[PDB]
RNA sequence: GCUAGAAAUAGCAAGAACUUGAAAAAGUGGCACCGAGUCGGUGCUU
């Protein structure tokens, strides 16, 4: 019936789930192929695909290659020729002297009314089509997406959004006056750095601006990388270099560099448009002409000066060509930087060299027309020049009038290539590109499974990479530098009387204690250093208005009753008393401008419609561009119908969600996530994403434009927010007065005063009268879904493509010679095929095997076995094929939800980060159910006895658990979480218990696989083909 | 390209599995309900 798909895209896993209207996951019967007696299996429509990174055919197909680009461009030229064909069917010296560069021809064709030869017109059009420019800016050129100021603000906004801890606030800066000024790149960089006292040229932001100006910054110090990663936007090989860089540090910084590129284009766009002589001209071509003219002037001046003053070495400049001279610059293989390095001392020595040096320092002296800068030209400019030329030559050529929109669409449409090329064009690491391809294939298979019925909704989450612990110190270092700078600026030696290190500053209440100068925020009294348990953590902006649990919106105080009776920010009576202390904490860079604004928001009226809209946009809109591109790919592949007009019929809505929504949903209703148990949590996150997405699109359809990707009817702030909290409640079409979007999930709403508001048991849409949430059946359903033990975890088997390396193994049945008599004995062996041997084997397998020493091979039974091939043995125990002589664990430990929640609460004991009432009730819940620990150990034991089969390790960990049974529950739960690594899917890894270290238990024997059941799994695992290998022989 | 010279050589100018296919590529895996130890059972219907 009606359904929706939830997706959790990551770098090592892709979670997927299908939900119905009642938020249930269907369980269906699937056919089982092969030659066994099992012909049907019942499977739950929920799972997660796993795929380790590596060298694969698919991977190379998704990499950018010169050849694919080349054929693309060639195709475009072919189309252009096809457009000119039907009418075409019905000088060198002159050209070069009249137009010494193509930009002369272009500017003439845009600014000349005279009739031109059609061949030159074709040359111009082909040059504009072949190198059409980037598509990072969407739509027509306008100051909103073109001026340097707005894009610089957008860059620092993206920066602060990506970090928010120690962010940069830039309001006084005049980005236009600094970046657009006519000076050298390095001097512009230093001039911008001078306006930011907290950042330096070698910092991350400094390196980003340097990258945007056209320099070659080094990002090793910003990310501590082992290998040097240099980036230059103008260089043609920047994209794959960025893809390498992003692969090292993750794709979260991808959008950052994208904004940097945009800033570069903006600076260039202001640098090119500055020489705007006439309003109706062609700025790019005219500027290239001016560059040519300056080149010509400087050239003739150089020859004059050289001939008069320096007769010697003229041949070295214009005749030798072997040492990168001017003759080498024009006729030889000498780059612009080499020519500058060669001609710098000649200009330094000579007299009468004024004016040439100010151009030399600005890197605009004797420039060529084919240089590294043309990659930055947007396509809207070429579209403008094309429109101008078409308008000038409209009456002369009728087919330009007839095919104007055709040519324009060919240049602007993004022709339509393959899906592999669309994924290859993306800006990200090969991992997320692989994941995107896998996601598309997963969607295709899922809609195939549902009788070719497309879902109503496809909810997308970009799964976050949990902390790798190398970053667990970086955050502590940044907050530590903030504390040290604030203390040194103020002058209160709290660190002298109470020394602390960056390790202890991870605690929320201690970090807030040091952020607040060891003083109460609301009262003029010193805080007790060793009585923080009695102290409460208050939210500057209540949770009823906005879900912000960062340090930016948190304070530490002895009692949260001091904020007063209002549900808003703390009252003016406290602000008036503490304004001096808050202004000293403000000017000491202990807090940001926004935090001071929120603390002092009652002085400027209180919450406003603009503030609530800003909160909604902060919570509901996704800033990451990569997510929008994934949604674009899925939307284009899923939605392809139209109507009579040129309007796209959107049958499937692609909803984009933030991780904070699902995380807070788990934390608020105790649907806790523990990644260490098994790999099911990806699928579970996908399911909860589907639930949350469907709930938001059903409750607030008019807010689709905020999350759903597409071109929808725009909206404002008046129709959304009610005048009064209660006096307009349930009597207007306004959806919500409180700015937190996730309130409709809650049954009750606790405000900042303590009054507990009640909401109906059944949530329905106001306009259409459709039930959107049943607060009873749906929570029971969610818990039931999280309790299901059968979740489809599939490891993508891949042939390796790129101490020899085995591409894949093969199952061979034949006979061999044994003993002195050379008697033939039938054998079945696992042979490893090297990457080199793969071609020869696929060319002629039998001859290869006969050369290897096998006799009488059965060609039909030769079975290809890539890495991670799954085999099943007795009692459902499963093993994956790692190599020709080693196996990996193939089972997933399914743990009941009650034990998962108990384990989370035991581990998250000190870091609950919640209200005291529920925190104490959770503590009592953990303490009362200590027996659950023994129960959990029993679970792993039975599970281990069934599928792991490691008696020695099990005895060791059982004994080690028996020695430390009386230890506290927190550390005990942590050591059980560590102990779960023994049963984790994949390769055995060494893990640490309380004082024990359990070494890996390798599986060196491989003979049993030869008589097990090989299970060929589809990408989702719903479709299985099971081959009983014991029957082959 | 311009001037000389038998040349050589000199002066100048200027800008997963399976099926079909060679391949790209097309195809192959029923619907509800009660449960839930890696999925089981029942009804309908191929």
Residue numbers in the entry: 3 to 92, 124 to 447, 716 to 1103, 1136 to 1366
Show sentences the authors wrote.
The guide RNA’s recognition sequence, or “spacer,” can be chosen to match a desired DNA target, enabling programmable site-specific DNA selection and cutting.
Indeed, cryo-EM analysis of the Cas9:sgRNA complex revealed only particles in the open-protein state, indicating that the original crystal structure of Cas9:sgRNA8, which was in a closed-protein state, represented only one possible conformation of the complex that happened to be captured in that crystal form. We propose that the open-protein conformation, originally thought to be unique to nucleic-acid-free Cas9, can also be adopted by the sgRNA-bound protein to enable its interaction with linear DNA.
